[PDB]
Design a protein around this ligand. Structure first.
Ligand SMILES: Nc1nc2c(ncn2[C@@H]2O[C@H](COP(=O)(O)OP(=O)(O)O)[C@@H](O)[C@H]2O)c(=O)[nH]1
Ligand SMILES: *C(=O)[C@@H](N)Cc1ccccc1
Lengths: 205, 371, 82
RNA sequence: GCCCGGAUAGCUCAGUCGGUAGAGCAGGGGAUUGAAAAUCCCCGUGUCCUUGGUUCGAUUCCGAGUCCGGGCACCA
RNA sequence: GACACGGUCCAGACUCCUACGGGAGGCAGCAGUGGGGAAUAUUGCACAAUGGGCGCAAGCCUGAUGCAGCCAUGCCGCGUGUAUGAAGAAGGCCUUCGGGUUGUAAAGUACUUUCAGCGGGGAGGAAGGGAGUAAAGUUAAUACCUUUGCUCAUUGACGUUACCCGCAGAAGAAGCACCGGCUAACUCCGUGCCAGCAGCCGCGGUAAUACGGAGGGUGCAAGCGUUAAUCGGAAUUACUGGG
RNA sequence: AAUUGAAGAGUUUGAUCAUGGCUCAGAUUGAACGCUGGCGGCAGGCCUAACACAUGCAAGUCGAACGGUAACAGGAAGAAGCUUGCUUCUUUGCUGACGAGUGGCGGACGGGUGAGUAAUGUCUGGGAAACUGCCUGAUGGAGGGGGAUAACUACUGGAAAC
């Protein structure tokens, strides 16, 4: 259900940094960004009506690495919730297990975060859970399995989180490497460089 | 895959040597152990008008799947080579250590020479009675004199000593010599379909004699033929309308299949072992053409002459690619050609077939290679 | 004859039982007059395992209804005393 | 498994009791026109399904294989 | 209680046995076969569980049921690895032949291992019932019988289960439609109103963003497109809501 | 806390606005085909011929109803080999149980199909001129006799059925 391909062609498609290749380098730069979407990507875009709705719709999916059917399922699950449907979106999409692991800093990249959740190394409430799309319950702890705790990879990942934002809707221990949770993520507390305004419209038609 | 054949003398141990390779290669590699009764009593088959008596034995090798032909009579070996009823490549020379090379064993080397049988892997049998190192070298020396005269290099053909009686019973001390015998064959389940039925209430009923393997009711089996290959599962084996679970090689029993209509299985198919054989449409063969008064032709044919090959259950037509130098194949030739088939089918270097055209006898050949 | 029996619901390899009151001449998940409580034999070690509405049941036995073996076992499982 | 009829240049068929294969509808190559039509100038492009025999010579004579169509079987 | 699926008598049709007089049968019950058709699976296992029938009970029957096998038919979860990696290569392609692009892609290197394959641990679905025994009812009785505690031996088709641990090695796992506007995403070459494309408007007549291929990119994903079918769009049957 | 809910474009024409059909953009399917195809969970899997059918199987149980016991396993009397109780072993319904028969109970449940049917049906809301095995509440009773038949014997028709 993932991409598993040249996952930086996505950043050149929209121009906005997706952080899919955070890694050991501060800023990528070895990607020839902003002027190479494809072989004929030198031609200026048309920016059509259906496209403006589409271009940010695919972008958010390229960020979360979510299946379109899975995106549509989360869409209608957000439709049957209280308040603004657009706001109902980002709360649930920030509820995906590996994404919280990414916010905790245990995962260098989202791809690395999901590669850890799949390999039964992650543990929530003393329970080994493997589904990446596990909706995190309000105020709960998430840690790493003992016999696979800090095995050279997540070790390198701990230094990376020091230069990250580390949001205010959770709390990371980093001593025993515990990913504790607080109140539901607010729209004003995230990156805020994404527009959910247009996303609600694409599925309206 | 390569088909071999025990050429030799009566009372030498050709049938027990054939039983030696098929049994022990079925315990450490795979296949089916054959009983001594079927290798001796060969069934009768009418090949192009004249009835022949041959026994087709098969066993599995780590690399390929080697076949084996064995005739109980000396009269049957005359037809086997000079015409080519049972196509053979690695002719196993069976010479006894007690008696030694005798006139009937000498003829088979000359009979294979004039025709074109390229490989002869010699195995000296019956060496469990005599114990003398000077005698071991003397019988081995009479064999080297019996191959050099017929255009066969005696310095590269391997010689393996042994005894086939205890190679059949199970004494491990002699089994290592049977394995290197088959090992030297490298360097130097299968079921032909003969009849098909369909009874009301069961489905498709396929009948044929088993050449190799053991059949269980409820196992996954594959079907290979000249038509579109499919997959099935064993749902019953019956003999004379009587239940027989353990289907062994040699038994001409009827098998029941799973989920196939009558229009998909016909004469020319083969129930094979799952994922063990691929189809071939391109191979090579060396044939013999007989005279008009004895059944064949009296005039040669051209390149492009496409006769019908009847291999063990088929009547498939194939186009002939005559080699350079060969333009007109006249009756009495023992020359070769490259055979191209119109249908994907399991073709091995040794599977036997009769060649017919005009609705009658034309000739027979020896499959040498698969291109 | 009215009987108090079970009703296999839920799914394959994960049963469930909604004890009901129906007739002996009907199907297992057939037509019934009233359902009274349920039973979850493979639920979990939690606060809720089985709810039996006894009062309504005693109301039916007085009419002439016969209880089933597995059903009566639940009545002793509810422990009339404590 | 067995028995007949079609297998004839793109297509439908004629020609046979041995003698170097026809016709029709075609279709098409060129001048003209932005391009065709009309008009004018000129035409077979065939393994007679495959393969062989009785050979000065086989489409046709005797045979088979395979494809298609049309009839009957047999019942582990 | 039927005017009766696995009952009766009668007539007819389709089959069958036949000692030719006379008889037998009903898969629209589980499977299964012929045929029909564009198209739809095993002549499986157990009564462990629920329920049904008989019996005081024990048990017995249970193609109801509970499971298994089979099919991508649909939904849903998940995997085909991640990090690093510029001479920004080879090869492919385009080209203002400068170079760009495929492209961090790969190779190389460092780690990890779900699900598979191999070998061991191991729930729950189980409530009862059989025998024994204590007490209390019942009785003339410490008997019999019943009920309530308890003990013992246990009862599992699925089942080489669920789940868990461990071993080995990136090791076994990615295609499908599209690319003129509608509608997201392009050029070149070959073929020249020929071959073909197609949902509609329409393209191809020797310079095709629409034909075929190649490269690139685009949409979706173990699914992708197509066809058949309904509703919606259709306020083109309008009561809501038209003339 | 419990219906937080509605998009359009192309196409008549030289060009425009209209009226007005046609088409597509979406969702879905008891699906089929083409192609490809790793595992698992839960559902569904003969829509056409209500077409015809091989074979096995799909509803039997009760000895706490009775006569019997044809078998199986004990007991008991006995009988013979002979290791004098180690065995062989012929009678016997005396028991456990049990083919066939009589009787009770079920067979009208469960399972499948949608052919028929436009109101004798179904759905909705009421109703009175009914019956109701099995289970249950309440009040009493449960006294006394006879005549047959299946199983089983003898004979016997019929290929079988019977
Ligand atoms: N001692 C001894 N005798 C043998 C050996 N092989 C076969 N024989 C004997 O030879 C006899 C006949 O041999 P067989 O194989 O029937 O010969 P064919 O049928 O004419 O091939 C049998 O009695 C076997 O005992 C052996 O290796 N050693
Ligand atoms: C059916 O009986 C087969 N097992 C044996 C057979 C007999 C006669 C002809 C063909 C096969």
């Amino acid at each position: 259900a993932r991409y598993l391909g040249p996952k930086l062609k996505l950043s050149r498609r929209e121009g906005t940094d997706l952080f899919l290749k955070s890694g050991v380098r501060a800023i990528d730069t070895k990607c020839k960004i902003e002027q190479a979407p494809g072989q004929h990507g030198a031609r200026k875009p048309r920016l059509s009506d259906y496209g403006v709705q589409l271009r940010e719709k695919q972008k958010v999916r390229r960020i979360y690495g979510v299946l379109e059917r899975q995106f549509r399922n989360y869409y209608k699950e957000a439709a049957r919730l209280k308040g603004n449907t657009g706001e109902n979106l980002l709360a649930l999409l920030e509820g995906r297990l590996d994404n919280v692991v990414y916010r905790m800093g245990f995962g260098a990249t989202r791809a690395e975060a999901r590669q850890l959740v799949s390999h039964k190394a992650i543990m929530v409430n003393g329970r080994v859970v493997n589904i990446a799309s596990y909706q995190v319950s309000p105020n709960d702890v998430v840690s790493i399995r003992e016999k696979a705790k800090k095995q050279s990879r997540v070790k390198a990942a701990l230094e990376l989180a020091e230069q990250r934002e580390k949001p205010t809707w959770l709390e990371v221990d980093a001593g025993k490497m515990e990913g504790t949770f607080k109140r539901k993520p607010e729209r004003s507390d995230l990156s805020a460089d994404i527009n959910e305004h247009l996303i609600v419209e694409l599925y309206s038609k | 895959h390569v088909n071999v054949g025990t050429i030799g003398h009566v009372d030498h141990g050709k049938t027990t040597l054939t039983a030696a390779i098929t049994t022990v290669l079925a315990k450490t590699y795979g296949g089916a152990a054959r009983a001594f009764d079927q290798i001796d009593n060969a069934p009768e088959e009418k090949a192009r008008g004249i009835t022949i008596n041959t026994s087709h034995v098969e066993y599995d090798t780590p690399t390929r799947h080697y076949a084996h032909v064995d005739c109980p009579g000396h009269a049957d070996y005359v037809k086997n080579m000079i015409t080519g009823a049972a196509q053979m490549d690695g002719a196993i020379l069976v010479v006894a250590a007690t008696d030694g090379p005798m006139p009937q064993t000498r003829e088979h080397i000359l009979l294979g020479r004039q025709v074109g049988v390229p490989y002869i892997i010699v195995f000296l049998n019956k060496c469990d009675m005599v114990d003398d190192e000077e005698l071991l070298e003397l019988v081995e020396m009479e064999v080297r004199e019996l191959l050099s005269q017929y255009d066969f290099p005696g310095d590269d053909t391997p010689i393996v000593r042994g005894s086939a009686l205890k190679a059949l019973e199970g004494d491990a001390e002699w089994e290592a010599k049977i394995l290197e015998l088959a090992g030297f064959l490298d360097s130097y389940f299968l079921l032909p379909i003969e009849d098909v039925f369909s009874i009301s209430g069961r489905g498709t009923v396929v009948t044929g004699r088993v050449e190799r393997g053991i059949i269980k009711v409820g196992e996954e089996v594959e079907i290979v033929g000249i038509k579109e290959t499919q997959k099935s599962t064993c749902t019953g084996v019956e003999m004379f309308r009587k239940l027989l679970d353990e289907g062994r090689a040699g038994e001409n029993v009827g098998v029941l299949l799973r989920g196939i209509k009558r229009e998909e299985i016909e004469r020319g198919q083969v129930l094979a072992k799952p994922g063990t054989i691929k189809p071939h449409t391109k191979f090579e063969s060396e044939v013999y053409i007989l005279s008009k008064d004895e059944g064949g032709r009296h005039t040669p044919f051209f390149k492009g002459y496409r006769p019908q090959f009847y291999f063990r259950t088929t009547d498939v037509t194939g186009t002939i690619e005559l080699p350079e130098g060969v333009e007109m194949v006249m009756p009495g030739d023992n020359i070769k050609m490259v055979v191209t088939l119109i249908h994907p089918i399991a073709m091995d270097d040794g599977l036997r077939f009769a060649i017919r055209e005009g609705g009658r006898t034309v000739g027979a050949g020896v499959v040498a290679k698969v291109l | 004859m009215v009987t108090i029996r079970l009703a296999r619901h839920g799914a394959k390899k994960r049963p469930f039982y909604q004890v009901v009151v129906a007739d002996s001449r009907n199907a297992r998940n057939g037509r019934f007059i009233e359902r009274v409580g349920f039973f979850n034999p493979i639920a979990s070690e939690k606060e809720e395992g089985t709810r039996l509405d006894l009062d309504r049941i005693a109301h039916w036995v007085g009419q002439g209804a016969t209880i089933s073996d597995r059903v009566a076992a639940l009545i002793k499982e509810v422990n009339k005393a404590a």
